[PDB]
């Protein structure tokens, strides 16, 4: 829904990388090159950003009750 703070397997910080990863993908990087530029070497950290579904953006399209 939102990017996890830690990689589930190892605990590397990936919560500060989702917007940087989206900006790299917008800058015509491939997904592998964007993951390599962010220092995600292990494939456990790469599945964090590769397989993330950012559902919070679509949740923010609803008017808040509070």
């Amino acid at each position: 829904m939102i990017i996890p703070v830690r990689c589930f397997t190892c605990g590397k910080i990936v919560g500060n990388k989702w917007e940087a990863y989206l900006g790299l993908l917008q800058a015509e990087y491939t997904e592998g090159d964007a993951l390599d530029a962010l220092g995600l070497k292990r494939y456990c950290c790469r599945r964090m950003l590769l397989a993330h579904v950012d559902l919070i953006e679509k949740l923010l399209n609803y008017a808040p009750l509070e």
């Binding site: 829904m1 996890p4 397989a51 993330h52 949740l59 609803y62």
Partner: peptide, 22 residues
């Protein structure tokens, strides 16, 4: 469903971090 905060279903289940499959 996306609007699960609006709905009050009798039974509802929401994962924290669902991922698309690799």
């Amino acid at each position: 469903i996306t609007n699960f905060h609006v709905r009050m279903d009798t039974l509802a289940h929401v994962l924290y971090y669902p991922q698309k499959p690799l």
